[PDB]
Every structure is written in structure tokens, then in C-alpha cells.
Amino acid sequence: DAIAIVGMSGRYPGARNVREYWDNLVHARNAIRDIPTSRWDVDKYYDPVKVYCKSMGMLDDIEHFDPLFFNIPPSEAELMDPQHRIFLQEGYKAFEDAGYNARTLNEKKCGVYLGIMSNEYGVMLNGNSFAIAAARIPYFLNLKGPAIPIDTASSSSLVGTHLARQALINKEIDMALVGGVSLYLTPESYMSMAGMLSPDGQCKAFDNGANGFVPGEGAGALVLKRLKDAEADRDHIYGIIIGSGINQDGKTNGITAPSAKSQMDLERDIYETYGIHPESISYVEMHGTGTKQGDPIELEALSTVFQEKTDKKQFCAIGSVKSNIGHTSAAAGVAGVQKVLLCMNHKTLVPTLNFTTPNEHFEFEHSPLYVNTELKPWETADGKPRRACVSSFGYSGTNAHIVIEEYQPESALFVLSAKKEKQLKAYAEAMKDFVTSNEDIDLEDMAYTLQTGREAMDYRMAFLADSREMLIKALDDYLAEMPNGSIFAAHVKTKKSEIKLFETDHDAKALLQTWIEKKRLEKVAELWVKGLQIDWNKLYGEYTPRRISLPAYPFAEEYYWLP
Amino acid sequence: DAIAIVGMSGRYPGARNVREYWDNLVHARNAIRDIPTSRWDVCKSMGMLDDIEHFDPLFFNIPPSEAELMDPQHRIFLQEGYKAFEDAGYNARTLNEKKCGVYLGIMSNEYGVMLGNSFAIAAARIPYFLNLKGPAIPIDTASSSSLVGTHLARQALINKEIDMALVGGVSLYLTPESYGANGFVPGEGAGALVLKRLKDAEADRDHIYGIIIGSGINQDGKTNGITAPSAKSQMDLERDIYETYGIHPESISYVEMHGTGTGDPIELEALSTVFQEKTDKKQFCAIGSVKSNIGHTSAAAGVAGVQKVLLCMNHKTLVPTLNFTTPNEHFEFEHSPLYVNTELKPWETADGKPRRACVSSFGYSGTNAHIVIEEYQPERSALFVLSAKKEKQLKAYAEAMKDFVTSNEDIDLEDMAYTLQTGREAMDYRMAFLADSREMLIKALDDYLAEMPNGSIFAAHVKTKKSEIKLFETDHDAKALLQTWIEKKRLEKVAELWVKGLQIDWNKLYGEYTPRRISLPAYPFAEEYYWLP
């Protein structure tokens, strides 16, 4: 039936994580910049009549990777497509977002469905196949569901979502990691203009000035489970997928042109199959690429389908994050899904950009649809969960559309760890920022997530806190190296002898067990940082807190490029 | 539930089509040859396709100059995919707007680099040409690709998301750069299957090669190096399929192994262990690998193995696996359910049970597939018509038909005529004739090709005869006379008119015996050379 989204991670232009993404959306920020000479010299390719677009939504630090984290030799990292490297990182972080770690993922039947559509690095070099890109995560984490790359161009990551959903519903897998990654490394690729790109370097989605898209870069991942499992497992749930479908354009006027009729059939068939009335939908993240003949076709299709079922007018807001970040290609679907989930979580709609005058080939006034350009509350009537759709159409003519529904659910000991001390310090910084930004964080849920939803790695710190202010101060003291008697820290490999007593003696174990049961947190903390395995479940009696989303591992930022 | 395979087409080393492929398997032929300098200047061996440069772009409404810029993987699959539909007896008219998915195994980009050529487009060429409306997805899981695609198509069909699938794979080895058991020899190939729900295939009176009764896919996960196999994943994959679908290993009498000649002992042990969990019976399941004949055809490996199995079932015959002198030391056969079949022999089954077989396909990225196939057990002059887009191809079509009839002494003439009438598109160059036996049919095609006058043979180019058939298209008495003819047995008249362009309602030829579509030779494409510009 319903598929829960239980974890997410993303990296988009202007946004290193989904928190910065949300902040950028709320503030109507546009991330598109001129391409710098550190990528390639646009002057050497630019002609106005060659490339006619000089702009891109670009990711920062595409060369950065933490190969040692993944048991990969540094020299092999230079030979790996950065698409692979960046997805490996984001995919891993999505699992940590959900509160799953290597131990809890080991041997899981988790499918991996990866949207990917380009091979620039591998060519520049003359390991880098799409097959291997999709398999890196399963190899690392010892997953056992199928690992399949999907290249249906810009619908890839939504196609992958559809396949994962079907596999989950058929019980062939028990979890999925779905995602997409796109980079534009070369003037040659990004180039293919084919007439596709905007000379102004903006996706003017829905606007009469729409004249092509601006390429964008990105990487994102979602972790999916059947809703009944997610509820039994006490996952945190961002939203639910309640319908999806894929089809083809078939014969169009040129193989890259869209089909109104296919888009209508796709949407109608989904809504009929899954019993979804268009009146119940209040937002659609459109494919919305800002192409002159594409945009009106999309609007007219969707509008027509909605109007078959209702006479209600201007009840469904439409937008496209491509107006913020550009066209992120194989990652486009996952970027749109994330935007929708964030909007649902905060009960807020955010502006779509670059919209001055409606496209002349479509009349909005008598449409179910309207273009939302305002930051505003996402209102819903009565009890009802919010619902939204996401569309993603590819140049090869394979289309996808999904429907998402809002999910409506019925002293603490803080521990942190990393593979290197420098990354522990970066972790503490990330947590301090997060807590600073999130004044309402539930401290007991946060601690419980750090205890049970993160792997205990070799460099450790821990401390007690009963409030946000105390928590912030401990992290500050840790970072400033300023003495604080409630902060503990150690490198596990250095403390083996100091812990052995509690691992082998029967009365020591019984005293440790008693300590954990009577919540003697200072004692548990000192021993944990030294490497002692703590049975965290024993800390909790009648009441067990819940896993929540927290910042995920701060990878080492080591540069690797062509050998 | 069950998925029917209603069409196939294939092009492998030494075999231009599935009929030659079968002939080569029966005779234990090995297609591996030394790589010639015309490919590159030289492992010096490959299972190679012939004339990989050849394409018929005009047939596909593609400009000849575009053809040079198309990855021959795309071109060749477009041809084989099309032909699979014609094998099944479907044409552009009957496929138009069908919800048919396309799932294409493909794992290399050599041409594009040497130089439109994305995997996404490769999968979309057929849907664009035929106006298909199911999703078109390329699959790159390396050598398990075409079997992974078969699994996905099967699940979409079961879930009613599509009403037909075209599944296939294609691999070519174009560059030196991308290139007892001692490793594999690379092979080239392209193959396609057409799939439907069994209930639809029976209602539609399709011819059915076999049925898929179970499939699954999984991953190796963490192995010792990312290209190493996992015994445990292979076992879990097979066990899960057999349990999910209620399949007893005792019922299985052939397995087409992944069998790359590297890996081999892990595969044997896994499958043997799974079977032995459920049965004590010894040496009842033959194993083989067509990679011994044609090399490792990579993305196409799964489809090549499935086709071999279907062909074996259809002819109730097991064929030798090659290059086997002594068993791999790391596996003991004697007390195994499994035995290596090296004989051409009858495929025996007990008390009228359908034969069952499995096909395994494992990729270097660790995504595995396995399917289970079951044998399907089904419950006067004729008017032969042939047409092509050019006269030269019409002649090539007539030759292919004459060879087929010559080779097949038990062909049902009424089923063949029916297939030509209802299962082929009426194209601009036309011929037709009457025949009431195999001998007369062979003689008519011979006469046609030898240009010997024969009063039973008609032929025309449709664009040249327009004025001459208008008399029948619009008049109500003319339609009645035509309708009368489609009835008092004057096939000669129907034939003359058809070749000139008149649209005939073939259903009207049949009262309440209606023949059945069968497999016949498919379009003989123009063999035009296109390579790098």
C-alpha cells in the first residue's frame, strides 16, 4: 500500500544539505551563477548566436571525498567518477538521517535505485560503469536487494522511485535507497544547447519568457520502507507515497519533444488506479523546465486532467525548484520530492521564481492551477492531510509522476563519534549549529538517536545535558578545549586495558548493568568513550524516546581529481 | 501469475537468426574466431557478429546521415526488437498506442566515445518508431542486464502497469581498449523477447514459446572485491524464488548456468546445495552454458540463454554444452542433483509434466538474476501475401520464406497464410499467390524469384495502381462484389486486388475455423553500410 519516506539527504546548488536547501527555498534564493574558469573558460566556448549559455547551478567542492571512510585506497579515489563519490556519500548520509547504521543495515534486503545519465569523468580519464555506481553502497554496507542504475535522462530518479515502490509492495525488498546524481564537468556535455538551453541562464518555469533551461548539478537520496514496517520500527516518517506511475511519449515530432496525450494518460491512470481525486491535491512540483513548447504542454495536460474531475478553480499551487537551482537532470526527481516533503513538514508553500507574466499559450484564470510566488502557510481543510504531486519527464520520452501525502502520526547522555579526530570536531560543530538553529529540538529523542542511530566509531566524545543551553555550552567547551567536568573524550584504541575489566569480570558487568539501569550517566559516559559497549535499550524503561533527523557524518574534505 | 513469451528474435555469433542459432546448438558448433584486423590489429579471440555496420535507416524513418552517428548497438537492437514483434505476428498498426514497456540490457558506449547515443535513447528508439506507451528503460547491471529487465517487465505485467513488454539485450566489443576453466571469451549479440500475461496471450490466440513462472533479483553485497561472487546470495536468490512461487527443485530438469568458465564452482555448489535441501534424487538436472558456443555476450547473455531454453523446450531436445572434458576439481558431481549434459538427446519428462528449466545471470557489479521457465502445453487453396518497402527486400523476403518452407516439411499452410495476411504490415511492394500444398508453395516462390511466368502469381507496386483500385474502395456494389469474392472462393481475384493496394478484410476469409498465427521469418532489412563519418 503506502510507502513511507524515512530518511533523506541532498546536496544541491547553494545547499550542502537539505536544511540549507529549505532555508534557500523559504528565502526565494536563486543559486544559478556564472560558470568560473576553475570549471572551464566560457569565453573560449561562448558565442551568442560553441555554447550560448554561460550559467549553471553548480555544486561546490565536487572533488572532495573521504575514501578511507569507505575502505577505498586514496589512489583509487582519483580514478572514480565524482558522481560515484558524491552519491556514495549522500546515500550513506540518507541512511544515517533515517537513524540506520552499518550494523543495522548488514544483510538487509535493501534495493538501490540510482538515477545517473552521464560518463564525463570516465571519458576524461581516457570502475566507472553505471552498474558499479549503483553497487558501491551495497558493497560497502553489505545490502542484498538489487542495485540498478536508471538512465531515463531527467526522469531517472523518479523512475527509480516507482520501481522501488513496486518492489517494496511486492515484498521483494524490505527497504530501498533511491536517488540521482548529475554533474556537468565539460564544455562539451553541458553544451548541448540542440536548442535546449536558455540564453539568459534561467529556468523561467510557467513564464511567457520561457526559452530553455539552465543546467544544474545535484545529488540526493531517499530511504523508503513499507508504511506498516516504518510504523512498527518506530522510524521517523517524512511523508508517504500513495501512488506512482511511468510511461512513454511514444511517437512525437522529434524524439525529444513531449506528448500531451502521454502526460494526461500517465496522470489520469495514476489517479484512477489509486483512487486519488484531483481536488485532494494542493501542490504540484512540475517538471517545469522553462522550455517554450514544453511548459504549456505540461500545464495543459495537468489542468485538463484535473478539470475532468472538478469545476473548482485555482485550488492547486504549482511550482518548480528548477527556478531556484537549475535543471539537475538525473537528480531532478529526488530534488522535487525533497522540496515537497520539506514543504509538508513545515506546512509552508514557497515561491517559484522567474515568473513575471503567465505563458500566453495557457489560461490560468479558469484553471484548477495557479502559480504560487508567495511564501505562505500551506492550508488544508478539516482534518485532511496535505497532498502533492511531482512530475519528471525525460528527453528520451520516459515519464514519471508520483503522489505524496503528508504523514499524520498518532539529564540526557549525548554521544558522538568519528573515524578521525578532525571529523569528530566537525561533527560537534555540525551538531552545535543544528541545535542553535533548532530551538525546539527534543533532547531525549536527539540523545537516543545518537546512541542507537549512529555507529560508535573510534574517536569518541560524550556529555550530559538537560537543556538546550547546557548542550550548546558543552559542545562549545569541547570545541574550545576549555575544561568541563561533564565532558568525556577518548580514542578507543588507546584505552583497551582500561575497559577489559568490564568485559570479562562477572561482577563488573553486573555493576555496569546496574549503572545503566539506574541511569548513572557520568559513569556510562566515561566508559562508552573508552570503547565499552553499552546496551542503550537498558537506559529506558516504560518510556523509549524516538529516532529523529540529525546531521549526518561530516566526511573528510580531501581533494581528488584526475591522476 | 504466468508470463507468456509470444515472440523472439536473436542475432548471435555464427547465427543471423534464432533458426540458425538452434541449428548451431543442435550440431554443437562453436562460433568463436580470431579477431580480424578489419576489427582491430591484435586473448586474440571473440564471438563476433557479422556486418555490425549494416542498417536499414529508411525503414525506420531515419536519415541515412543520422545512421552514421548512431551506435550500432542501437541500430542492431532496433532491428532485432522490431523482428521480435513480427515473430509474434504483431505489426505497426496493431502495436500503435499499445502499453508495451521496453526494457533494454546495455552496458557499453564505445561508438559514442569513438565519435543521440545515450542508454536512455537506445531504449526509446523502438517506442518512438512504433508509438509504444509503456516505459522505456535501459538496464546496465552488466552481464545480468537482460535478465534483470525480464524480471522488471514481468513485475509490471503482473501489476497490470503494462500490457506487453519487449525485453532484450545488446553487446558489441568495438575497441581494443575494452578488451580447465581459465576465464571467458567475450561475445557479441543482440536478442529480444516479447512478453504478455498468459491469460491475454491465450485470449489473443498468440503462439506461445513458454511461460515464466518465477523470477527474482538480488545483490552479492559485500564480497572480497566488488567483482567476486557470493555463494550465499546465489543460494538465497534461488531458494527465495522457489519458495515464493511454490517451485520444487525436483521439477527442474535443465539449468542454463551463468557458466562463464572462470566463479564456476561457486555457482555449482550454490545451485546443488539449494536443490539438495529439498531432494535426495541424483543427477536428474542437466546443466549447460551457451557461452561455451558463442562466448560471453555480456548484456545479451540472459536473453541468449532464455532463447536457448525455449528452443530446447519447443523441440523437446537437450543440446551439448561444449569444452567439457573433465569436471572442475572443486565440485563433486557424482552425488549431486546436477550433471553436465554433453549429448544431443531427447529431453525426457515423466508422465506428461511440462518441462521446467532455469536461467541464471550474474553481473560483475554483483546484481544477480534467476528465472524459471515452464514448457507451455496448448489444448483447399490458401492465399499467400508478402510485401516490403523496396522491391529488392521483397525478393529477399521471398527467398527467406522459400528457405523456411523447404526446411520445415510439416508447416501448416493455412496458419502460414493467415500469419502473412494478419501478422504483417501491407507495404508498398507486393506479391501474392495461391497454393494448396507445400510443393506448389515452393514452386510459386521459385517461379517468382526465377521470373518464370506463373498464373498463380501476382505482383505490383501499390503507388502505380491507385487509379485501378478506386473502382472498389467507395462503390457499394463493388464492395459487395469484393465481399462476395472474399467468399465464393475466388482467392485469385482477392490476390490481384490486394497486390494493387486494395485493403482486404482478412477476417472475412474465415467462417468458424480460423487458423493461428505462427512464427515465420521477419523483415529482411536492407543491408547498407554505415560507420563513423
UniProtKB/Swiss-Prot annotation, chain A:
Function in brief: Involved in some intermediate steps for the synthesis of the antibiotic polyketide bacillaene which is involved in secondary metabolism.
Entire-sequence positions represented here: 2874 to 3462 of 4538
Residues at the active site: S154, H287, H327
Protein name: Polyketide synthase PksL
Subcellular location: Cytoplasm
Gene name, Swiss-Prot/TrEMBL: pksL
Domain Ketosynthase family 3 (KS3): 1-406
Swiss-Prot record, chain B:
Segments forming domain Ketosynthase family 3 (KS3): 1-375
Subcellular location: Cytoplasm
Domain of life: Bacteria
Catalytic residue positions: S143 (for beta-ketoacyl synthase 3 activity), H258 (for beta-ketoacyl synthase 3 activity), H296 (for beta-ketoacyl synthase 3 activity)
Function: Involved in some intermediate steps for the synthesis of the antibiotic polyketide bacillaene which is involved in secondary metabolism.
Protein name: Polyketide synthase PksL
Organism from which the protein derives: Bacillus subtilis (strain 168)
Gene (UniProt): pksL
